[PDB]
Amino acid sequence: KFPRVKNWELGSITYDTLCAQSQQDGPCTPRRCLGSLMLPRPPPAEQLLSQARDFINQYYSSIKRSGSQAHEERLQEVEAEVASTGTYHLRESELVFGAKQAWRNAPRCVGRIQWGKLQVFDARDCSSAQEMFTYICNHIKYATNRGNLRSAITVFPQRAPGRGDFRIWNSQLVRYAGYRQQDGSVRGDPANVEITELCIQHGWTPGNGRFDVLPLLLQAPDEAPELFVLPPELVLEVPLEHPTLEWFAALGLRWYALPAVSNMLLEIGGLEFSAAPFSGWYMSTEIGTRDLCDPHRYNILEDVAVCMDLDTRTTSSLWKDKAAVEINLAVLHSFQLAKVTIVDHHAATVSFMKHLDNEQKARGGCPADWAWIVPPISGSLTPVFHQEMVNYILSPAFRYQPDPW
Amino acid sequence: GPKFPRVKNWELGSITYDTLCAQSQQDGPCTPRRCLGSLMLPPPAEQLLSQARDFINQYYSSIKRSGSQAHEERLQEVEAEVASTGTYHLRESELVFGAKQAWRNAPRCVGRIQWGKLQVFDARDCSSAQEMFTYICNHIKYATNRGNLRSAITVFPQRAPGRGDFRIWNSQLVRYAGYRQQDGSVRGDPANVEITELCIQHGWTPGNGRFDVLPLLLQAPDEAPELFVLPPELVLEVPLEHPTLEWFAALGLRWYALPAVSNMLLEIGGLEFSAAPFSGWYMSTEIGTRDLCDPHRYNILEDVAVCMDLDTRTTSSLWKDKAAVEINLAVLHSFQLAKVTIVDHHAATVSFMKHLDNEQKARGGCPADWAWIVPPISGSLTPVFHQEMVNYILSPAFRYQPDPW
Numbered sequence: 150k151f152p153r154v155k156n157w158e159l160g161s162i163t164y165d166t167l168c169a170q171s172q173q174d175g176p177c178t179p180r181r182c183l184g185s186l187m188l189p190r191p192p193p194a195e196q197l198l199s200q201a202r203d204f205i206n207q208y209y210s211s212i213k214r215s216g217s218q219a220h221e222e223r224l225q226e227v228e229a230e231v232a233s234t235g236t237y238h239l240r241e242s243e244l245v246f247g248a249k250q251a252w253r254n255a256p257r258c259v260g261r262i263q264w265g266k267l268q269v270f271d272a273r274d275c276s277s278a279q280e281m282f283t284y285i286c287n288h289i290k291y292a293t294n295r296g297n298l299r300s301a302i303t304v305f306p307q308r309a310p311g312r313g314d315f316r317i318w319n320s321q322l323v324r325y326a327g328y329r330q331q332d333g334s335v336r337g338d339p340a341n342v343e344i345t346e347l348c349i350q351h352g353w354t355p356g357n358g359r360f361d362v363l364p365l366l367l368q369a370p371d372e373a374p375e376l377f378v379l380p381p382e383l384v385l386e387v388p389l390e391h392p393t394l395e396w397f398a399a400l401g402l403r404w405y406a407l408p409a410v411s412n413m414l415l416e417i418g419g420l421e422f423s424a425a426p427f428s429g430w431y432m433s434t435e436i437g438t439r440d441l442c443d444p445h446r447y448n449i450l451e452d453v454a455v456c457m458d459l460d461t462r463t464t465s466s467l468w469k470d471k472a473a474v475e476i477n478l479a480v481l482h483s484f485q486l487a488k489v490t491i492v493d494h495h496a497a498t499v500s501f502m503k504h505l506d507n508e509q510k511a512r513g514g515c516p517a518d519w520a521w522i523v524p525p526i527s528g529s530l531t532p533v534f535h536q537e538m539v540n541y542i543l544s545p546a547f548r549y550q551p552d553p554w
Numbered sequence: 555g556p557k558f559p560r561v562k563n564w565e566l567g568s569i570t571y572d573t574l575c576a577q578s579q580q581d582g583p584c585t586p587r588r589c590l591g592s593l594m595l596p597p598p599a600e601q602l603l604s605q606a607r608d609f610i611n612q613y614y615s616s617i618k619r620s621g622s623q624a625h626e627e628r629l630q631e632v633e634a635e636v637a638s639t640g641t642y643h644l645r646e647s648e649l650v651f652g653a654k655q656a657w658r659n660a661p662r663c664v665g666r667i668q669w670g671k672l673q674v675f676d677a678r679d680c681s682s683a684q685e686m687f688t689y690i691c692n693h694i695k696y697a698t699n700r701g702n703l704r705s706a707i708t709v710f711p712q713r714a715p716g717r718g719d720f721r722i723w724n725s726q727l728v729r730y731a732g733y734r735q736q737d738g739s740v741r742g743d744p745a746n747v748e749i750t751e752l753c754i755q756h757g758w759t760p761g762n763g764r765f766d767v768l769p770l771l772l773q774a775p776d777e778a779p780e781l782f783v784l785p786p787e788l789v790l791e792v793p794l795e796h797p798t799l800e801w802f803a804a805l806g807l808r809w810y811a812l813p814a815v816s817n818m819l820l821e822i823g824g825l826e827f828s829a830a831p832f833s834g835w836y837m838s839t840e841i842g843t844r845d846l847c848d849p850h851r852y853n854i855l856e857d858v859a860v861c862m863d864l865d866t867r868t869t870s871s872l873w874k875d876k877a878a879v880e881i882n883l884a885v886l887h888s889f890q891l892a893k894v895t896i897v898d899h900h901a902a903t904v905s906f907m908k909h910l911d912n913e914q915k916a917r918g919g920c921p922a923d924w925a926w927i928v929p930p931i932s933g934s935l936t937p938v939f940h941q942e943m944v945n946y947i948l949s950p951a952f953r954y955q956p957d958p959w
């Protein structure tokens with residue numbers, strides 16, 4: 150019934166009772182576990198009302214005013230609005246709580262210890278791409294804070310029956326262009342070829358570098374997306390150098406300071422916010438290991454290996470591991486040098502272990518996707534590796550949604 | 555596409571559908587409500603016969619005589635034997651096929667590309683602890699083959715109706731003693747404290763080293779386990795040295811050449827071989843990262859970092875990652891130097907990807923435990939990290955079984 154959860158380094162055990170609260174099915178079945186899969190393979194009033202009531206219930210419990218008159222009243226309002234219109238609207242205070250909870254509930258996020266400190270920007274009174282742009286710029290400016298990153302989410306208008314969605318076509322507010330060159334090779338970020346091509350097709354004048362910040366393609370309901378170039382001065386970047394390998398800086402690598410996913414759907418009380426970009430700060434391995442070393446990304450491992458006089462002749466010399474480490478070291482040093490918030494995978498995983506403990510005491514468990522929580526390098530050297538985790542869907546939730554094009 | 559788990563490789567963008575999972579006749583620990591994929595752990599002649607029939611069909615299918623007279627005759631013979639005795643026996647060739655399929659079916663084994671080359675030693679005539687010892691020594695001699703390791707499995711008599719099980723108490727045929735000290739610390743391998751104390755409780759005169767090879771506690775049916783000291787000349791060990799760090803050899807570290815899980819249960823067609831130790835060869839991270847660096851194992855990370863003069867006071871220096879890499883390198887280098895078979899995590903995972911391809915063609919899929927297949931260090935640097943995997947239980951299988959004490 151309730152999963153027994155063990156930490157194999159400490160021998161300690163817990164029981165996840167929070168999973169019982171899951172109302173949404175994951176991809177697994179007793180026949181086969183698909184936990185390693187990255188993505189999943191006008192709503193009826195009843196369904197919506199139950200999700201809304203549940204969320205409103207979560208909200209009043211949150212302020213320790215459950216059952217109160219304010220609680221009864223609010224539930225009536227939602228009920229009244231759904232019955233008459235088939236949908237309802239959240240009050241800003243609920244939206245704030247809901248966004249924090251979606252973050253707290255994100256199984257793939259290792260930075261959830263920060264969940265309670267989230268600046269929520271209510272952008273639901275946005276009626277045009279132009280306005281979306283203004284709010285996005287404010288988010289970036291607020292969130293960056295001159296390198297002293299602060300967690301934030303900007304919430305745009307909720308989806309509405311039979312009307313197009315507000316959408317940010319970009320997968321992140323800040324991302325580098327990926328230009329396909331004859332050879333089939335890609336200049337810049339291969340993960341962003343399609344979006345780069347969409348921007349171009351929509352009138353963007355493309356650059357030709359390896360780190361060209363993409364412009365935003367913002368879409369107001371049922372309108373073609375519009376292009377907006379982010380003011381370069383709002384986009385903080387960090388040049389990468391190594392603390393002892395002088396030649397590192399010569400690779401001309403750099404990365405943006407602000408990780409800001411912008412293609413996920415924020416679901417709260419049955420309401421869907423198709424555009425709700427959020428940002429916290431980077432864990433170094435995201436940049437040092439995945440962005441820079443994934444073979445299908447910048448794939449710089451070999452280059453750094455060679456620059457290190459490593460024997461890339463054989464895998465047994467562990468040249469890849471060695472290069473990967475210095476790259477990650479480079480990222481950390483650089484961000485620390487540029488005084489831009491960044492957390493290493495050890496500090497991060499240790500704080501996530503504390504978060505697991507906080508959540509165990511607070512809610513009796515914590516949904517966590519082990520494959521995502523365990524860092525991409527030095528997995529077992531971090532505490533989360535030895536920690537069993539239970540993965541399930543709690544709502545409020547951030548979820549994937551189809552690309553708008 | 556089709557109606558089976560859609561499996562994607564995110565590095566190559568390639569897709570496959572697992573149809574093999576349809577053959578799974580045993581539930582795993584996951585449900586639509588939650589994924590427990592990261593958990594280390596989780597006779598009615600009627601139930602046996604169905605498993606036995608299934609296995610005989612598997613066997614006859616493998617020799618392409620499915621539906622043949624021999625096939626129907628064996629099926630009838632098995633039902634008859636089970637009918638009059640409650641159990642049945644496998645023909646030699648069936649045992650060989652079964653042991654190989656069990657390995658082939660092992661979701662946690664990254665070395666499955668070698669599944670077809672398993673040397674199956676039939677020890678089903680073994681009738682005493684002393685003889686188990688002889689069989690085990692023969693396995694070790696044959697498997698070690700002076701360093702040019704050969705995968706092998708020695709199958710002792712299957713579990714019998716009322717009779718006691720043949721059991722090897724040790725978790726592996728070769729493991730180091732773990733001596734609980736007065737100050738609570740452990741000298742040797744903390745993972746082996748219990749078995750070490752069990753060997754003492756059974757008359758073993760304990761050594762006092764950090765690498766004392768444990769004796770074997772072998773148990774023939776309904777008899778207390780007997781203690782057998784492996785002749786040192788049969789236990790090949792590899793003193794650890796680093797290719798460049800000359801002081802590493804001074805740490806006096808060493809590991810044994812033959813990894814030989816000896817406490818797993820080999821299940822074939824419902825028959826249970828409680829003693830069927832198997833061995834292949836090591837993937838270097840098993841020793842270098844887990845055995846030597848797990849905080850709950852030899853925990854030598856800090857010692858090596860101090861020797862490397864790293865800043866162990868801060869996580870951001872990545873001292874753990876740095877030392878871990880060197881330790882793993884020392885392991886690969888030493889085994890290669892000592893001419894003892896070993897495979898690094900890069901070679902093993904690439905070979906496993908080939909295996910996935912082979913199996914996709916041969917069986918329409920391959921059960922794999924992602925958390926276990928992806929190596930403990932440099933996870934995303936290997937191809938399996940970017941490979942979605944479907945985990946399910948097929949039979950024949952190797953299963954954990956309770957410790958006999």
Ligand code: HEM
Pocket residue numbers: 248252255257258259260261263267300301302410413427428429430431432435492497521547
């Ligand atoms: C404050 C510091 C934060 C850090 C250190 C952090 C770190 C991480 C990391 C390492 C991942 C995995 C990223 C990947 O591999 O693609 C992740 C994923 C995620 N985080 Fe956080 N996070 C933070 C803030 C936030 C905030 C503020 C939100 C939302 C309000 C959030 C929501 C999520 C979600 C939904 C995922 C999954 C994203 C996906 O599936 O692509 N995170 N986070």
Ligand code: HEM
Pocket residue numbers: 653657660662663664665666668672705706707815818832833834835836837840897902926952
């Ligand atoms: C030929 C060389 C082989 C290599 C390189 C290899 C490598 C591995 C590795 C790295 C693991 C994970 C070990 C751990 O993390 O504890 C493993 C697990 C396993 N291997 Fe293989 N293996 C090989 C041979 C074999 C053979 C001959 C068999 C059986 C006939 C086998 C059966 C298994 C099983 C059942 C597991 C899971 C054990 C457990 O749950 O503790 N392997 N193997």
Ligand SMILES: N=C(NCCC[C@H](N)C(=O)N[C@H]1CN[C@H](C(N)=O)C1)N[N+](=O)[O-]
Pocket residue numbers: 260320408409410427428429430431432435436
């Ligand atoms: N630190 C993060 N990280 C999440 C965004 C950065 C991440 N490294 C990234 O590039 N995400 C992409 C690529 N993989 C995700 C996916 N689902 O495919 C989206 N978030 N935050 O708010 O502080």
Ligand SMILES: N=C(NCCC[C@H](N)C(=O)N[C@H]1CN[C@H](C(N)=O)C1)N[N+](=O)[O-]
Pocket residue numbers: 665813814815832833834835836837840841
């Ligand atoms: N390469 C192996 N590896 C499996 C045995 C060595 C492995 N590194 C080990 O120490 N396994 C122990 C500790 N963890 C496993 C468990 N289930 O707890 C058993 N086997 N082989 O036959 O070639």
Ligand SMILES: C[C@H](O)[C@H](O)[C@H]1CNc2nc(N)[nH]c(=O)c2N1
Pocket residue numbers: 184185186187520521522564939940941942943
């Ligand atoms: C196939 C596998 O699920 C996939 O590569 C996952 C593994 N773990 C991950 N972990 C994090 N943090 N981010 C990712 O993108 C992934 N990708």
Ligand SMILES: C[C@H](O)[C@H](O)[C@H]1CNc2nc(N)[nH]c(=O)c2N1
Pocket residue numbers: 157534535536537538592593594925926927
């Ligand atoms: C909790 C988690 O399942 C556990 O630490 C697993 C992770 N992956 C592993 N992978 C391998 N190969 N071996 C192990 O012992 C483990 N331990």
Ligand SMILES: [Zn+2]
Pocket residue numbers: 177178181182183184584585588589590591
């Ligand atoms: Zn699962």
